[PDB]
Design a protein around this ligand. Structure first.
Ligand SMILES: *[C@@H]1O[C@H](CO)[C@@H](O[C@@H]2O[C@H](CO)[C@@H](O)[C@H](O)[C@H]2NC(C)=O)[C@H](O)[C@H]1NC(C)=O
Ligand SMILES: *[C@@H]1O[C@H](CO)[C@@H](O[C@@H]2O[C@H](CO)[C@@H](O)[C@H](O)[C@H]2NC(C)=O)[C@H](O)[C@H]1NC(C)=O
Ligand SMILES: *[C@@H]1O[C@H](CO)[C@@H](O[C@@H]2O[C@H](CO)[C@@H](O)[C@H](O)[C@H]2NC(C)=O)[C@H](O)[C@H]1NC(C)=O
Ligand SMILES: *[C@@H]1O[C@H](CO)[C@@H](O[C@@H]2O[C@H](CO)[C@@H](O)[C@H](O)[C@H]2NC(C)=O)[C@H](O)[C@H]1NC(C)=O
Ligand SMILES: *[C@@H]1O[C@H](CO)[C@@H](O[C@@H]2O[C@H](CO)[C@@H](O)[C@H](O)[C@H]2NC(C)=O)[C@H](O)[C@H]1NC(C)=O
Ligand SMILES: *[C@@H]1O[C@H](CO)[C@@H](O[C@@H]2O[C@H](CO)[C@@H](O)[C@H](O)[C@H]2NC(C)=O)[C@H](O)[C@H]1NC(C)=O
Ligand code: NAG
Ligand code: NAG
Ligand code: NAG
Ligand code: NAG
Ligand code: NAG
Ligand code: NAG
Ligand code: NAG
Lengths: 431, 121, 187
């Protein structure tokens, strides 16, 4: 069964790259503003130092992840003013030069589907004073020593990196990932990529308009499907927020003491009897911080594996053409385009799909004069009465000639050989 | 958490970034590679008289490709390059004597600790 | 060293020294202090072992990656981009390092580029000719076929291209002659 038509399909893949960076003030969480509790807590300083070392390790690893995914190339390419790409329209994934953020249309759609817990990192003391505290969750966190640190690269820098990658791929093919960028017309690059899945160039050059229309329609479908999906990127936000709020809620546990309020214990009890209750509370709250830090470490390990996978995809699907099955989408991989998303990356994989199949009878070899002829790079098929040779992935019948097959042995060994004539296109010219 | 005052000292060189208020650093209009990351795109360094300077980190050089619809570029020479990659494979193997760490040579502490043997195992 | 330093914590006991507690206190009153110390030191050991487990998992991932590199870069030639260095991978050599491995990746880098005008096909006699495995270029006046990664111009012949269809469909076809290197010999 040989396909007769094709389909050009664009699919999306979503990957998380980084998580929220956090820091803890140990004394602020355990004791608040009680001097006596701090003097009692001075016996456990090593544990707070150890917890902070673990958190800072996680925090620097997050920036390393983002650097490894997005900052591969250090040349910031610019897209040409003339958009003459053989009828392919990349306007939906190129940066809009009029919005404040220089983001593409699809990136703008993606950024409105993930809602960050807090926008901005400057919440002033005067902003939440009195009622607003203990009602707004961020201020409740911040009055107990729990702070969120901003990432090193802003959204605009990552958008710049993705736009540089896109301009490189559509102006220079895959050469800019191996060295200096070498310019090439876009249709000739498309013909090279068709050569790389086993389809001859003339198929692309004859069907160029159909292929361009299919690509444009697929991009339009992607756009119309996003303005209507990103759970992998929302669950990271939800998990970090939930962990911080659970730490804030666990401050109402007695742990076997008379009360959970230090000020209630410090009044009504003298130091020798207040010390044992404060000690119980201190042990419980150190355990809560330890549990939080351990689960943060395990989550950071998972995010690191995801970011390594994203870097490998960026290298092998965007900066080249991949032959490993299902790594860069479903079908024969043609090319990929990256887009930045909040805390992650989206890949647009363009692949080739065989469309309409027809049935033929086939044979391994042809027996002409006691010789066995085999196809050089095709397959032998029959429409019922006549015998042709074609290519495996597209139906393009041709007459069997000697410049088209090769001989090996006689006809006594091949199991299913058939009888037919081989043109040998020299005899007419010699005559 | 200050927009420039809840500061220890004001001094001079008060500079506002999206990471917060930075005091004690000079702001320059250049863009170097990042030495010490401050955040939100801002980096710091110690330069030349010597002082701490704060700047916006550069992403790299900007070069535009000369694209046309009937124009190709073919290499004429090559280079053979050798590069190195370093990978960790193993770590230190350790063992702990639980009684030696918790009790030392105290017999009474060991008799008391006999209630927690499963955890050491 | 952090485990050794954490032995000076009281954990809410009178002292951190067992011998100091065992003298000056009788067994029924010494038992509660010793119990506090025991609980604290078991917690320290537990924390150490947990962080060792997480670090061991990270080292295991790194060692799996190193084994894959040894198989695919040293025992073969890899076509996946940037797995075995920057450029077209030629070969790799391993060297041992304390607790690790170093790979020496030899790769090929294209050096000096020149500009040419190009065309998808050639129209000879109402037929369209396409390169078998090269690209069509022009120095300005003449047309040659070359290979993509190195410049080695050659005359366009029929043993060098292949025909498909006429010249009415290919967008940017150009007019040139195809040698056909048999006619002189037949004459
Ligand atoms: C191969 O498939 C394409 C569809 O992907 C066919 O093109 C369509 O043809 C119908 C009518 O034949 C038109 O109504 C559609 O608008 C066409 N689609 C596009 C995108 O232009 C094409 O005709 C098929 N070719 C063969 C030989 O079957
Ligand atoms: C490329 O795609 C864009 C987006 O679909 C096209 O621009 C649209 O053109 C239609 C009319 O055909 C307008 O109604 C839309 O408002 C346009 N959108 C935008 C964002 O401007 C564009 O015409 C296509 N072709 C080219 C060559 O760019
Ligand atoms: C199998 O293919 C052969 C060869 O192409 C077909 O024979 C051609 O049929 C058309 C239509 O009648 C004629 O115009 C050609 O002159 C025929 N060529 C030859 C060499 O005879 C044949 O029709 C096909 N068989 C079937 C069952 O479709
Ligand atoms: C610090 O406060 C200043 C003063 O209000 C802020 O500057 C304003 O920012 C808003 C936000 O878009 C603008 O609409 C105003 O026009 C700005 N006013 C002036 C005078 O610049 C500034 O945003 C604050 N700093 C940070 C980091 O948030
Ligand atoms: C290709 O590049 C090499 C350099 O990598 C050139 O060889 C050098 O040539 C210069 C003078 O032309 C000598 O001074 C160097 O010592 C040579 N290098 C080596 C390693 O021998 C070579 O000439 C270039 N070829 C072309 C055609 O440009
Ligand atoms: C383009 O290439 C042609 C063909 O090689 C060049 O023509 C040759 O030029 C040399 C130097 O003058 C002569 O010795 C050859 O006899 C020429 N060959 C032919 C077939 O005429 C031509 O010089 C090149 N054009 C440019 C602008 O460099
Ligand atoms: C090929 O033949 C099988 C056998 O009946 C049939 O089921 C199948 O539909 C045929 N394929 C096409 C494309 O007609
Ligand atoms: C195919 O099967 C038929 C019987 O159904 C048999 O006669 C014929 O020899 C077989 N051909 C091959 C190539 O196996
Ligand atoms: C092919 O031809 C040979 C001799 O011409 C004959 O022996 C053989 O049976 C033929 N194959 C058939 C009829 O399938
Ligand atoms: C930096 O640029 C701004 C505006 O472009 C200008 O006001 C300021 O004086 C410049 N700083 C220096 C040191 O030149
Ligand atoms: C190729 O042409 C472009 C267009 O001006 C030019 O910028 C580039 O330097 C040229 N390449 C070489 C190697 O001369
Ligand atoms: C290249 O662009 C020119 C206009 O700049 C146009 O006339 C020519 O037909 C184009 N050729 C191809 C192959 O697109
Ligand atoms: C190529 O030749 C054909 C006929 O010889 C002519 O119609 C066509 O215009 C030519 N192409 C040019 C002049 O670009």
């Amino acid at each position: 069964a040989i396909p007769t038509n094709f389909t050009i399909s664009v699919t999306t893949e979503i990957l998380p790259v980084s998580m929220t960076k956090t820091s803890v003030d140990c004394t602020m969480y355990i004791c608040g503003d009680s001097t006596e509790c701090s003097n009692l807590l001075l016996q456990y300083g090593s544990f707070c130092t150890q917890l902070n070392r673990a958190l800072t390790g996680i925090a620097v690893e997050q920036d390393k992840n983002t650097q490894e995914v997005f900052a591969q190339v250090k040349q910031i390419y610019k897209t040409p003013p003339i958009k003459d790409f053989g009828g392919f329209n990349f306007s939906q994934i190129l940066p809009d030069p009029s919005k404040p953020s220089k983001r593409s249309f699809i990136e703008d759609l993606l950024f409105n589907k993930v809602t960050l817990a807090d926008a901005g990192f400057i919440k002033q003391y005067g902003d939440c004073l009195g009622d607003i505290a203990a009602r707004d969750l961020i201020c409740a966190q911040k009055f107990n020593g729990l702070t969120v640190l901003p990432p090193l690269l802003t959204d605009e820098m990552i958008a710049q990196y993705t736009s540089a990658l896109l301009a490189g791929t559509i102006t220079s093919g895959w050469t800019f990932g191996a060295g200096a960028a070498l310019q090439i017309p876009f249709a000739m690059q498309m013909a090279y990529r068709f050569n790389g899945i086993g389809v001859t160039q003339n198929v692309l050059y004859e069907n160029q308009k159909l292929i361009a229309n299919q690509f444009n329609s697929a991009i339009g479908k992607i756009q119309d499907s996003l303005s209507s999906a990103l759970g992998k990127l929302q669950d990271v936000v939800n998990q970090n927020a939930q962990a911080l709020n659970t730490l804030v809620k666990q401050l109402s546990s007695n742990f076997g003491a008379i009360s959970s309020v230090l000020n209630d214990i410090l009044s009504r009890l003298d130091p020798p009897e207040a010390e044992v209750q404060i000690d119980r509370l201190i042990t419980g709250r150190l355990q809560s911080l330890q549990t939080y830090v351990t689960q943060q470490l395990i989550r950071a390990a998972e995010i690191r594996a995801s970011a390594n996978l994203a870097a490998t995809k960026m290298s092998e699907c965007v900066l080249g053409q991949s032959k490993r099955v299902d790594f860069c989408g479903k079908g024969y991989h043609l090319m990929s385009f990256p887009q930045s998303a909040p805390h992650g990356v989206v890949f647009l994989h363009v692949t080739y799909v065989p469309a309409q199949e027809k049935n033929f009878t086939t044979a391994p070899a042809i027996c002409h004069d006691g010789k066995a002829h085999f196809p050089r790079e095709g397959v032998f098929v029959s429409n019922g009465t006549h015998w042709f040779v074609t290519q495996r992935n597209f139906y393009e019948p041709q007459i069997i000639t000697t410049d088209n097959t090769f001989v090996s042995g006689n006809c006594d060994v091949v199991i299913g050989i058939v009888n037919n004539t081989v043109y040998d296109p020299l005899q007419p010219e010699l005559d | 958490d200050v927009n420039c005052w809840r500061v220890y000292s004001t001094g001079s060189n008060v500079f506002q970034t999206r990471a917060g208020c930075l005091i004690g650093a000079e702001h320059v209009n250049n863009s170097y590679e990042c030495d010490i990351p401050i955040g939100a795109g801002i980096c710091a360094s110690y330069q030349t008289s010597q002082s701490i300077i704060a700047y916006t980190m550069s992403l790299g050089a900007e070069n535009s490709v000369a694209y046309s619809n009937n124009s190709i570029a073919i290499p004429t020479n090559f280079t053979i390059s050798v590069t190195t990659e370093i990978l960790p494979v193993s770590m230190t193997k350790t063992s702990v004597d639980c009684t030696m760490y918790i009790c030392g040579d105290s017999t009474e502490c060991s008799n008391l600790l006999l209630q927690y043997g499963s955890f050491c195992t």
